[PDB]
Amino acid sequence: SMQSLKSTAKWAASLENLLEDPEGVKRFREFLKKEFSEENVLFWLACEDFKKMQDKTQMQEKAKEIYMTFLSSKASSQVNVEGQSRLNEKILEEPHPLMFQKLQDQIFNLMKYDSYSRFLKSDLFLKHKRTEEEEEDL
């Protein structure tokens, strides 16, 4: 893996680069993951993939799925955004894909602000933070 120099420049260039480059989504997830915000990173991925492909019934069950897992009223955490008393199952009884893209664009904005202030808080630019440690050697 050559991901160190240019890679960090990529993701700290634009959030799109991060959410485009596989290694970005990988290493960035691990960060929030261990800091307990994987709900955030997975939410965007899920709603975007949900936006790109899904059958009708599946989509509806996935609508309530992503809501219940990442947002919900508690979700054993949830990201601190519009969600607590928002949506509610009452709208999941008639859910549509693009309706989440509203929250997606929202979390995208919050993501840049917050998630940058997180990733650039504990810079994984160091191997002593991003766990590689060992050499390839043999």
Token pair 């664009």: residue: 105
Residue found under tokens 């480059």 = 21
Lookup: tokens for 137: 């050697």
Write the DSSP string, 52-101: HS--HHHHHHHHHHHIIIIISS-GGG--SSTTTTSS-HHHHTS--HHHHH
Token pair 């949830």 in the structure block, residue: 78
Check residue 115 and report its DSSP letter: I
The two three-digit tokens of residue 117, written as one number = 């202030």
Q: What is the distance between the alpha carbons of residues 25 and 65, in angstroms, rounded to a whole number?
A: 21
Compute the distance between CA of residue 31 and CA of residue 120 in angstroms, rounded to an integer: 11
| Pair of tokens at residue 44 | 């965007």
Q: Which of 104, 71, 100, 103 is nearest to 85 (CA)?
A: 71
User: Does residue 17 contact residue 24 with C-beta atoms inside 8 Å?
Assistant: yes
Domains in the chain: boundaries: 1-138
What is the rounded CA–CA span in Å between residue 97 and residue 63? 8
The phi-psi region of residue 104 (left if phi > 0; otherwise alpha if psi is between -120 and 50; otherwise beta) is alpha
CATH 1.10.167.10 fits 1-138, yes or no: yes
